[PDB]
Amino acid sequence: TPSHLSDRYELGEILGFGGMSEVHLARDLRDHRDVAVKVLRADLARDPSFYLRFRREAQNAAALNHPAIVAVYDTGEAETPAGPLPYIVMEYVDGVTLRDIVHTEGPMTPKRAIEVIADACQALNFSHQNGIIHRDVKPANILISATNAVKVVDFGIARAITAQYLSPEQARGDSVDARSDVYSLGCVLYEVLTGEPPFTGDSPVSVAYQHVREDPIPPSARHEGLSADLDAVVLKALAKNPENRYQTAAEMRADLVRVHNGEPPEAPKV
């Protein structure tokens, strides 16, 4: 990868690695600001199967406009003498992932967890009202900024009509919809609350199997300082049948809000 893309974006340190792409902190020398640039790993920039796969993801990136969603600024294709190198330029978030927080700091307090997840529900809801399912909600895809704001990254591109955060339907290979993001957000909620996701296993298959077939253990049975109410919410978000989950991320956030307040939630009492 070159030091500069398009004589505009000056690549700096790696923020994170993804499937085929890596995200860099960079200076937009033209707009004079720091940005995040997602590029295709240089080695992979010759396999056409990858160049094409990435360019569609870039061309068709979810460009949503919401405080809790990392914006998309620009998309491009640079010119290293070796070859054309495709990239997406995005909002930069000076912060750390939920995955890092949970790992270095452990489970959050119920109050903090609720604030974080309800804020994620807003990003998800705004995304949903705009026709877009994230499909990969998970702690590594939720960012917390230095000033403590939630920023969600890595929305999947629109479609036609590991495994710790899959919904039963993705696991079965059935069709997914907004409710599917709901289930996954609940997995994250479960983890920030208890230090662990609902299901663990020796292999993605095992975990997938559990999502589809095993009853989750109520969070309070795995960590202290969790109320029965809060249990009911998490458990509803984790319902096996989409028909029985929260129907929208809004519904989910409203029940989270009630628990923050200390009011009984609309969720069932197990």
Ligand X SMILES: CCCCCCOC(=O)[C@@]1(O)C[C@H]2O[C@]1(C)n1c3ccccc3c3c4c(c5c6ccccc6n2c5c31)C(=O)N=C4
Mask for 210-239, x = binds a second copy (CB under 8 A): x-xxx-------------------------
Answer yes or no: 100 catalytic. Answer: no
> End-to-end alpha-carbon separation of the chain, Å?
54
- The nearer residue to ligand X, 38 or 236, going by C-beta atoms, is 38
Binder to a second copy among 12, 204, 264, 268 (CB under 8 A)? 204
Helices marked H in the chain — which ranges?
A: 48-59, 98-105, 110-128, 168-172, 178-194, 204-213, 228-237, 249-261
Cα dihedral across residues 110, 112, 113, 114: positive or negative: positive
Structure-token pair, residue 1: 């990868």
Instruction: Please tell me whether 155 is known to bind a ligand.
Output: no
N residues, the chain: 270
Interaction partner, residue 203 (a second copy, ligand X, none; CB < 5-8 Å by kind): a second copy
Q: Are 236 and 255 in contact (CB under 8 A)?
A: yes
Write down the catalytic residue from 28, 34, 136, 177: 136
When asked if residue 36 is in the footprint of ligand X (CB under 6 A), the reply is yes
- Output the furthest CA–CA distance in the chain (Å, rounded): 63
Binding residues for Mg(2+): 141, 154
Positions annotated as catalytic residues are 136
Per the annotation, binding residues for ATP are 15-23, 38, 91-93, 138-141, 154
| Footprint on this chain of a second copy (rule: CB under 8 A) | 14, 17, 41, 43-44, 46-47, 49, 135, 162-163, 166, 170-173, 176, 199-210, 212-214
